[PDB]
Amino acid sequence: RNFNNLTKGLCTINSWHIYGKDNAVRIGESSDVLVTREPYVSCDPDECRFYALSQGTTIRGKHSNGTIHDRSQYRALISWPLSSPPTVYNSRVECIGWSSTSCHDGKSRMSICISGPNNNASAVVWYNRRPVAEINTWARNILRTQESECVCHNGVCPVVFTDGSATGPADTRIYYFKEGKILKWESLTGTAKHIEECSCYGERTGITCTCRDNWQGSNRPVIQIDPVAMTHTSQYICSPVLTDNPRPNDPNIGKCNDPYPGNNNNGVKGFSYLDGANTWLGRTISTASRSGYEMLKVPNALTDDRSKPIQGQTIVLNADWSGYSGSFMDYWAEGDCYRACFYVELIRGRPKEDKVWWTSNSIVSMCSSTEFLGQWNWPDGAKIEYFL
Amino acid sequence: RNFNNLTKGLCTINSWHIYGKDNAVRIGESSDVLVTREPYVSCDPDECRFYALSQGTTIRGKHSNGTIHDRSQYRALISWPLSSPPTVYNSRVECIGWSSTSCHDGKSRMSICISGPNNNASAVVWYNRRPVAEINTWARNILRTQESECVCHNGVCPVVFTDGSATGPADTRIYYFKEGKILKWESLTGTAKHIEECSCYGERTGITCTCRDNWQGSNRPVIQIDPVAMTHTSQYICSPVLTDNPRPNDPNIGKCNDPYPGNNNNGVKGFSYLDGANTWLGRTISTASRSGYEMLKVPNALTDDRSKPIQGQTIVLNADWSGYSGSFMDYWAEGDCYRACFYVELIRGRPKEDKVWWTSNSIVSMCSSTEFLGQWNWPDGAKIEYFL
Amino acid sequence: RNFNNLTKGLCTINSWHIYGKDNAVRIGESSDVLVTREPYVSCDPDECRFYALSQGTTIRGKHSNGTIHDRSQYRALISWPLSSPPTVYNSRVECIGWSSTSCHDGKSRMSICISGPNNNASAVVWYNRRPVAEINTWARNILRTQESECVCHNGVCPVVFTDGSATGPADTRIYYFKEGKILKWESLTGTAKHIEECSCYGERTGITCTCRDNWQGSNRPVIQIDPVAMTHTSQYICSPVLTDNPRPNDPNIGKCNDPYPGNNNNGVKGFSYLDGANTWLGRTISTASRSGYEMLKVPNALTDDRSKPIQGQTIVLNADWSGYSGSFMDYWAEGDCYRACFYVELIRGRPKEDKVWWTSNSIVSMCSSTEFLGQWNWPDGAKIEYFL
Amino acid sequence: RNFNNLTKGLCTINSWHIYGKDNAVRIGESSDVLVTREPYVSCDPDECRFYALSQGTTIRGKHSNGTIHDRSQYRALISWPLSSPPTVYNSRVECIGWSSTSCHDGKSRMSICISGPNNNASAVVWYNRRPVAEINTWARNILRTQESECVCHNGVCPVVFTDGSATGPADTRIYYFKEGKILKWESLTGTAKHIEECSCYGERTGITCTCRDNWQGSNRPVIQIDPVAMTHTSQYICSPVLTDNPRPNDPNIGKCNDPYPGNNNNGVKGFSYLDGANTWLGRTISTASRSGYEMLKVPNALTDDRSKPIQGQTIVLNADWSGYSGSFMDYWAEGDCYRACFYVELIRGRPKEDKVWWTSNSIVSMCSSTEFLGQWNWPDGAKIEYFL
Ligand SMILES: *[C@@H]1O[C@H](CO)[C@@H](O[C@@H]2O[C@H](CO)[C@@H](O[C@@H]3O[C@H](CO[C@H]4O[C@H](CO[C@H]5O[C@H](CO)[C@@H](O)[C@H](O)[C@@H]5O)[C@@H](O)[C@H](O[C@H]5O[C@H](CO)[C@@H](O)[C@H](O)[C@@H]5O)[C@@H]4O)[C@@H](O)[C@H](O[C@H]4O[C@H](CO)[C@@H](O)[C@H](O)[C@@H]4O[C@H]4O[C@H](CO)[C@@H](O)[C@H](O)[C@@H]4O[C@H]4O[C@H](CO)[C@@H](O)[C@H](O)[C@@H]4O)[C@@H]3O)[C@H](O)[C@H]2NC(C)=O)[C@H](O)[C@H]1NC(C)=O
Ligand SMILES: *[C@@H]1O[C@H](CO)[C@@H](O[C@@H]2O[C@H](CO)[C@@H](O[C@@H]3O[C@H](CO[C@H]4O[C@H](CO[C@H]5O[C@H](CO)[C@@H](O)[C@H](O)[C@@H]5O)[C@@H](O)[C@H](O[C@H]5O[C@H](CO)[C@@H](O)[C@H](O)[C@@H]5O)[C@@H]4O)[C@@H](O)[C@H](O[C@H]4O[C@H](CO)[C@@H](O)[C@H](O)[C@@H]4O[C@H]4O[C@H](CO)[C@@H](O)[C@H](O)[C@@H]4O[C@H]4O[C@H](CO)[C@@H](O)[C@H](O)[C@@H]4O)[C@@H]3O)[C@H](O)[C@H]2NC(C)=O)[C@H](O)[C@H]1NC(C)=O
Ligand SMILES: *[C@@H]1O[C@H](CO)[C@@H](O[C@@H]2O[C@H](CO)[C@@H](O[C@@H]3O[C@H](CO[C@H]4O[C@H](CO[C@H]5O[C@H](CO)[C@@H](O)[C@H](O)[C@@H]5O)[C@@H](O)[C@H](O[C@H]5O[C@H](CO)[C@@H](O)[C@H](O)[C@@H]5O)[C@@H]4O)[C@@H](O)[C@H](O[C@H]4O[C@H](CO)[C@@H](O)[C@H](O)[C@@H]4O[C@H]4O[C@H](CO)[C@@H](O)[C@H](O)[C@@H]4O[C@H]4O[C@H](CO)[C@@H](O)[C@H](O)[C@@H]4O)[C@@H]3O)[C@H](O)[C@H]2NC(C)=O)[C@H](O)[C@H]1NC(C)=O
Ligand SMILES: *[C@@H]1O[C@H](CO)[C@@H](O[C@@H]2O[C@H](CO)[C@@H](O[C@@H]3O[C@H](CO[C@H]4O[C@H](CO[C@H]5O[C@H](CO)[C@@H](O)[C@H](O)[C@@H]5O)[C@@H](O)[C@H](O[C@H]5O[C@H](CO)[C@@H](O)[C@H](O)[C@@H]5O)[C@@H]4O)[C@@H](O)[C@H](O[C@H]4O[C@H](CO)[C@@H](O)[C@H](O)[C@@H]4O[C@H]4O[C@H](CO)[C@@H](O)[C@H](O)[C@@H]4O[C@H]4O[C@H](CO)[C@@H](O)[C@H](O)[C@@H]4O)[C@@H]3O)[C@H](O)[C@H]2NC(C)=O)[C@H](O)[C@H]1NC(C)=O
Ligand SMILES: *[C@@H]1O[C@H](CO)[C@@H](O)[C@H](O)[C@H]1NC(C)=O
Ligand SMILES: *[C@@H]1O[C@H](CO)[C@@H](O)[C@H](O)[C@H]1NC(C)=O
Ligand SMILES: *[C@@H]1O[C@H](CO)[C@@H](O)[C@H](O)[C@H]1NC(C)=O
Ligand SMILES: *[C@@H]1O[C@H](CO)[C@@H](O)[C@H](O)[C@H]1NC(C)=O
Ligand SMILES: *[C@@H]1O[C@H](CO)[C@@H](O)[C@H](O)[C@H]1NC(C)=O
Ligand SMILES: [Ca+2]
Ligand SMILES: [Ca+2]
Ligand SMILES: [Ca+2]
Ligand SMILES: [Ca+2]
């Protein structure tokens, strides 16, 4: 077939509709559901699937004890059918490791998994389900990547990596792959001061990634990538509507070219859609912890350091646990525009619910509507007491 | 490929033969079978499948407690292979929500799921497994739809929706979709006074839907749709053979243009095949509760307010629990006529069997024969005591 | 594609090699394996599969209690991948009922399932996974069929049915189907006096079925069918090597045209390959019960009432339980001849092992070799005590 | 399609990257995972899969008791998706038996399974999922084969078999198959004195097999096969870096044409890649038992009796249990060279961990990189105490 080209703009976002939900923890109470975390969603030209890092055990399995741990030899990127839960019997292993990204270029899928000890990790780049290229750690401190889908244009698929400290300056690189081969890489440039866990989407203007500053900032850094020239810039979302977690309260002036201060050495993966007057930002409702989730329409959030919300939608009540969130779109859908989508990881278990000894999650996902739809809220839905 | 056209009449119905049965509750006693309700059956050009609303838990799972509840964030329309049970590992999620319909147009399948709180629900229309259009509540009172398959002609697939009171006048609309797009909608016209849970089938004359009057009537309202002109009429089945549940005893004069009185604010989804002398009506055997099921040959039931049965077939004994029933046909079968089919939902658990804390069902399904076949009866088959 | 034609002779049978074995009862001790009985094997042009009548419950499920019972509304013909066990999650339902046959004609598969009460049973004939024709009971006494595969030539697939007494004269019919349609049926002719559970195979000479005389005979009746003329003859295997069970000891003169006496009102489904000097007969080792299984090379067994064995092979030791056995071949294999195959049902549980309350089986299957291969024996392999 | 030809050399091996890992024992603690042993990996042109000999029971099943036993009627060669575990519901049976090999020739797959008692075993050769040829025992003492993949060139697939004593001279044969048919076989020639469990790979020079001398040698015998002429030679790896287990300590002079002495009547399946300066050898870290695993770069190991390591990589720590290891490659990958791969069987349970009554394994697999990648170690990961 042919490589996909980013030839459309975003659809107008007037509200968000339910797209997928797997109820994995509810079902896993009484089924062979794998413990996971760091989920995402990614489409092929003929199917969309859920993705996540398995922990190599089921929830009811005794090996679920200790799964708060992020990195082990028992983790792997798995995918499974949209809105099904990740079961032992329906999950397809994409590659082995504890940090990942994946995207389809229109012809085949590229998946990248990083594994190894903290001081000697390596990425293996798979294309069309075969290993093609490998990248060794350059800073010997937890080589790591997006934890959500990458995006491709005319065969070129950029991916953001970081290696180095999580609590100070680190070495971030943007890699440009084609058919799994390394075309080029560049060191991070621009005014973003620290980069983790980029959430990306593409449209005719280029590729936009909204990341996590784990060091000093509670505004989110943004990397904008031209996949044709294979170049990028970076800054922060200018808006005073702050979207990392934990975070300070919203001021009236944001920061475009430096971290907004108040919270250090922590954060959460998140996302945004930055599209002028059609801009929407995602964030946890709580400023203290990974609870709740909302979308806020914030015109020109990227560039306007005074911008505030003019519309919103609650996705998960503050009373309910959330977690990581990221962007994806069905680039192969019919129509004249790309419909913005996102997922929210709904983390259950440790550290917040420590009566159980495991940590897992379920997934909820939404896409945009041009209608102004009524809102519901979407909890994980499992009762912790049932697992005791 | 090509859109299916309704170019045939119904086959002559001389009896009913077994088509499918999943024994879901029997199997779910000792397997990872999802709790469901509101099942149906629908064919693609190359396969026929069972459908239902999952409750996002298995039967033996602790989350099965409380599944008498109709609407939650944990429900989804699932489909699975004909006569298999709906398991965690074989069920395909079509969309997320607590009211649904689905149909194949010959090229691709349209599925519609409604979700949300009672005062802010919305329908998402999926086509070829992608979300295409969305419809917001118009009466802010449980936007809801068929709970069985829709039917298509030359790409046009009509669907009946209701929004508003379940116990008085409500706002019913007929929507006409093509490739998931809204071509047109109309407010209900005709003499049907209240519409719920329409069961539809198509043939050369047009599309016929037999619905549930939940307000005052125990005769069933009928909507007849011309999918070419995109217009409809409505009335009730004229026959004094009453087919809702609960219901009064059969009189000798029915009602064509108004509810037959005696039972208010309740009902059950049901169906009929209205075809002159080849007319057959389905109903529960009991007039009081959802138990038993029978088919009755009632010539000209639609138009003759004196019509009585001249032949029948017991499907489920009165001693056994039934539930919802609806119509479907294999529009892609060989031959010169469409073979009428139906399913019966066999509800187990609450409220009728309250020693368990769950509510689920299994499915039995029949299609017509031109032979005069011997009859059996088809119970769910599970022993409640085994679940205690 | 094209209808298969029977254009080859049987390969020379010099021994038997292992073909498939599912170990279903061993695995079902700790997995969701369906209770079955009456298994067989049948090939499509691109795959061979195991078949059986499910009981609509797993072995460890509480509903396994009482599965010695032959006929219920919870039974169905299922198929599953060769040598896998019949699980809830991998079994495909072919049709609903408690007596079956199935065969591929080269283009599509025909499957036939009979259901109903003893006095009102009916067959539904499925073709290309759709119901096509139905046949009502003609003797009102357990309409029943082969319990192993049928065979097709140029689209014509003959099937043997019986309706009536199991312990006296009954009404046997041979039906000729094409694309599921009834071309013709004939009443049984010839010297076979009672017919049950025919096991059939085809080759250039025509179709040969070896059946069970449940009335007075312990030699097996044979029906020979010409699928072109759509005619048949019948007699018994002439050989004094008797192959029904239970049965008298082997005499030195068999019976060609009447039952060999000594055992009444019982029997077991079995098979043979009748091919002049290349003739092999299957039988239980025990004359008293369904235990053991052996193949015996008995030249001209069909026609020679003095014929004895000149070679043999033990398949299952007398110490181990067997059961039904039947013939099938891969008509789509490469080469100049059809390789004879068979399966043996290995029954576990009731009535012979009554410490458990269920009855199920596993499958072992062999095909012929032109080599003279060493023999092993093939027990079910499960330990009953594990189920207590 | 077309038969694959071996037209490329090996890629330069500068380190090894993670390829696959199934975590089968961890997952099997709480899922329906089959007990296995003797695993391997093999690619089709469109997919790579894990293979192993099932024991016909799950790990948690009561029939897992006694699975240290190598040969029973309940074993079968199964395959399943790369990095998934071998479950009851996802495992495909290739053939029945207790010793196997399998390989794809570019058009279809050949699989070979041996079954029978020790004195009467036989191989059945399957091609395109059908039995094609059979081979009877020639020495009446456990006919046996590779336990990892074979390799094909222009349709010709050589396979190494042994029949006879495991502790003295035996009868080894090299068979040459095409489309499952026997083209030719030869008795072993050359200086290898005993052959077991050959691990093979192919490249433009021909096919290279590294085997196990179970009799007197702790260096590994090598068979080099020309699949065009259908001839072979044999010797031992000349290097003093000894790679069998158990084994003596490494001397400074190896043995090219005779066993290196010190350990008798034992061994382990292993492998090597013999490619001049690009030579890498696999071995257990322990000289005493099947624990640990490492790769060592040993230039000209095949031919240089003084050769030592110049680079290495730990795969499994000595503290962790290993087991069998073997070679495979994706012959259908893109690029100008074949990327060397291997698997290591990670044995859990008996005899080394006798608090449980079963023996099973999981799989880890690596392929070569032209980068110099950081190393991790890859334990099975299950906690035995959880199974008590
Ligand atoms: C059925 O479903 C529908 C569809 O979902 C439901 O309708 C939805 O209802 C929700 C809830 O109300 C709405 O979400 C909120 O939207 C507002 C924004 O809209 C308001 O403000 C707009 C801007 O006004 C400004 O400019 C205009 C320009 O003309 C000017 O006129 C005005 O004076 C002002 O200067 C208005 O344009 C807008 O009016 C329009 O819409 C109205 C309906 O909403 C309609 O009535 C009007 O006629 C008109 O058409 C409207 O007034 C968001 O501000 C709000 O988000 C804030 O509040 C929530 C809590 O509710 C909070 O979680 C958010 O984070 C946010 O507040 C935080 O951040 C702010 C920014 O920094 C900060 O200022 C706040 O103090 C607060 O900060 C604190 O909390 C955060 C988070 O914990 C923390 O980080 C901080 O540090 C700090 O602690 C909501 O998103 C939907 O827009 C609305 N949708 C639609 C289509 O109507 C309907 O209710 C359902 N029906 C039923 C019966 O249930
Ligand atoms: C093997 O299998 C076969 C195939 O399945 C079995 O054969 C089947 O047997 C069943 C059971 O008998 C039949 O179902 C019933 O059919 C009758 C209708 O047929 C009868 O009436 C016909 C009409 O007669 C009228 O017009 C003719 C015109 O000539 C006139 O001559 C006559 O006098 C009268 O005016 C007759 O034509 C028909 O005769 C034909 O068929 C006969 C065989 O059936 C044959 O012998 C004849 O020679 C001739 O060929 C026959 O007499 C249905 O009426 C009946 O349904 C009613 O009864 C059941 C209970 O059994 C009930 O559940 C139904 O709901 C219904 O009765 C309720 O509704 C009525 C309508 O309002 C009402 O009047 C009743 O009082 C009753 O209402 C009460 O209960 C309901 C429900 O709870 C409640 O809602 C009300 O409020 C109230 O409380 C059956 O459907 C099959 O048709 C028949 N099939 C065939 C092909 O033969 C066979 O038995 C099996 N064999 C064995 C050994 O088991
Ligand atoms: C490795 O594997 C290989 C391959 O599997 C093993 O080799 C196999 O070994 C088995 C077991 O021995 C053989 O099966 C038996 O075959 C014999 C038939 O072959 C014998 O008889 C032939 C016919 O002889 C007659 O005609 C010839 C014409 O020349 C004449 O010369 C002769 O005198 C006589 O008149 C001989 O041709 C044949 O010799 C050939 O083969 C020999 C090797 O087998 C070889 O040594 C010779 O050189 C020559 O090449 C040979 O002598 C079957 O008769 C036998 O089946 C009977 O016995 C078993 C019990 O073992 C029983 O279960 C059967 O049902 C049957 O006996 C019952 O039925 C009879 C018929 O009515 C009846 O007469 C019996 O009394 C008995 O009836 C009783 O029991 C039944 C059942 O419960 C009951 O219903 C009755 O009422 C009654 O109670 C076996 O099938 C294989 O053929 C053989 N295969 C090969 C290729 O060699 C090898 O052993 C393995 N190696 C190791 C180390 O384990
Ligand atoms: C991040 O990851 C990276 C990548 O994985 C890590 O880097 C890797 O580190 C490992 C561990 O050190 C290395 O593996 C070892 O490799 C050595 C071989 O390389 C050494 O020797 C080479 C040859 O030297 C000879 O020739 C040269 C020619 O010039 C001559 O100069 C020299 O004097 C000598 O004559 C050197 O070329 C090489 O130097 C190069 O590489 C260095 C880095 O490694 C670098 O610093 C240099 O500048 C230069 O570039 C280097 O010195 C293997 O020998 C070794 O394997 C032995 O030891 C292990 C235990 O560690 C043992 O398990 C092995 O079996 C083996 O030792 C046994 O067998 C021997 C052979 O018979 C025997 O002699 C031993 O006594 C021993 O035998 C005993 O045990 C066995 C097993 O139980 C038993 O059977 C026997 O009977 C007996 O009981 C390792 O494989 C990697 O190569 C290296 N990779 C790279 C790319 O650098 C890095 O460490 C990680 N970072 C962090 C922070 O963790
Ligand atoms: C994307 O653009 C490239 C470069 O012009 C073109 O070759 C390719 O066909 C395009 N892809 C599609 C889907 O048309
Ligand atoms: C249905 O009718 C339309 C309109 O004439 C036609 O284009 C289409 O091909 C028909 N569908 C089939 C299956 O022939
Ligand atoms: C079988 O014979 C018929 C009748 O001549 C022929 O039409 C058909 O093609 C044949 N089938 C095959 C597989 O050739
Ligand atoms: C391998 O070589 C043979 C013999 O020349 C040739 O016919 C075949 O096409 C080749 N295979 C491929 C994949 O080209
Ligand atoms: C395993 O089998 C042996 C009999 O050989 C028995 O001694 C032992 O107790 C068994 N283990 C379990 C867990 O039943
Ligand atoms: Ca931060
Ligand atoms: Ca009503
Ligand atoms: Ca008999
Ligand atoms: Ca050795």
Side-chain angles (χ1 to χ4, degrees), chain C residues 6 8-9 201-208 224-227 274-275:
Chain C
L6 303 168
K8 307 174 181 178
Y201 69 92
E203 56 129 300
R204 52 188 168 199
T205 65
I207 292 165
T208 299
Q224 292 172 287
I225 305 167
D226 179 341
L274 306 169
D275 188 29

Side-chain angles (χ1 to χ4, degrees), chain A residues 29-230:
Chain A
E29 188 277 327
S30 77
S31 289
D32 296 325
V33 174
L34 293 164
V35 173
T36 61
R37 256 216 68 209
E38 300 83 27
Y40 51 106
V41 188
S42 191
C43 299
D44 288 10
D46 61 341
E47 185 193 1
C48 296
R49 294 166 66 84
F50 281 178
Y51 288 72
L53 296 174
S54 176
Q55 292 273 19
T57 175
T58 67
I59 312 180
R60 281 295 198 181
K62 291 178 180 183
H63 295 96
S64 70
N65 190 348
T67 47
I68 191 175
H69 198 56
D70 299 316
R71 296 176 301 281
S72 79
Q73 297 95 325
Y74 319 118
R75 301 205 79 174
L77 172 62
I78 52 166
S79 68
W80 66 96
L82 196 81
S83 295
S84 286
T87 78
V88 176
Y89 319 121
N90 75 336
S91 292
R92 172 168 73 215
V93 176
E94 305 294 342
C95 42
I96 307 300
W98 41 249
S99 186
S100 86
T101 185
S102 187
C103 49
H104 205 285
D105 64 19
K107 295 189 187 184
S108 296
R109 173 159 292 273
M110 176 183 67
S111 296
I112 303 180
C113 282
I114 297 163
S115 78
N118 296 349
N119 66 4
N120 239 345
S122 58
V124 182
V125 184
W126 292 66
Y127 186 74
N128 194 26
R129 318 208 58 83
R130 301 184 169 99
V132 167
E134 309 75 50
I135 306 162
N136 202 42
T137 179
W138 53 86
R140 291 148 279 112
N141 190 357
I142 315 178
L143 174 63
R144 56 199 183 267
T145 189
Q146 299 181 186
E147 326 298 1
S148 63
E149 81 167 7
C150 39
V151 188
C152 305
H153 177 77
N154 193 28
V156 178
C157 310
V159 177
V160 184
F161 291 84
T162 298
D163 198 345
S165 181
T167 58
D171 299 324
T172 290
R173 291 180 179 187
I174 294 84
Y175 272 78
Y176 298 87
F177 300 98
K178 181 167 171 190
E179 295 179 307
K181 318 294 250 323
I182 299 166
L183 298 182
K184 173 180 181 176
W185 64 265
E186 310 179 282
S187 297
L188 177 69
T189 194
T191 60
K193 298 309 190 302
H194 189 95
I195 294 290
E196 306 278 1
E197 299 170 340
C198 292
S199 300
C200 309
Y201 69 92
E203 56 129 300
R204 52 188 168 199
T205 65
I207 292 165
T208 299
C209 300
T210 304
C211 315
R212 159 188 174 173
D213 178 332
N214 202 64
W215 179 17
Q216 301 188 123
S218 293
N219 50 347
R220 291 193 175 279
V222 173
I223 298 170
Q224 292 172 287
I225 305 167
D226 179 341
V228 177
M230 301 185 296

